[PDB]
Amino acid sequence: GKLSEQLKHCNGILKELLSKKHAAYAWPFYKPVDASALGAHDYHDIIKHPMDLSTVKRKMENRDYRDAQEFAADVRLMFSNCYKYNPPDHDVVAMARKLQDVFEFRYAKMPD
Ligand SMILES: CC[C@@H](C(=O)OC)[C@@H]1N=C(c2ccc(Cl)cc2)c2cc(OC)ccc2-n2c(C)nnc21
C-alpha cells in the first residue's frame, strides 16, 4: 500500500536517472562497467560489488526490491564504487556527484 507507493517513487526516480534530461552526466552509469574494454584491469580487485542503472532496472522490473531502502542501497553502491575506484578530481567523479545530487534530493521526498 504505502510500501507499493514508496516503490513507485523509487521507480520514478530510476526512470528520471535514465532520462534524456540527465544523460550528459548519467551515461557512464547506464550499464555494467566493462573493465576489459576500458583497460581497467584492477577494477574488479578494487570493486567487489559492481552496480549500475541497468541492474537496478532489472531488479525493479523483476520485483526484486522489497522496499525503498533496498533500492537506495544499490543506487548508492553504484556511486560509492565510482568514488572508490577513481581519483576525486576525475570527470567521472563529478558526473557521479551530479547524478547523486539528483537522486538524493528526489529520494528525500519519500511518501510517508
Ligand atoms: C571503471 C573504470 C573507470 C575508468 O575508465 O578508468 C580506467 C571508469 N571511468 C569512466 C569514465 C571516464 C571518463 C569519463 Cl569523461 C566518463 C566516464 C567510465 C566510462 C564508461 O564508459 C562506458 C563506463 C563506466 C565508467 N566508470 C564508472 C561508472 N566508474 N568508473 C568508470
Ligand code: NI
Ligand atoms: Ni543506504
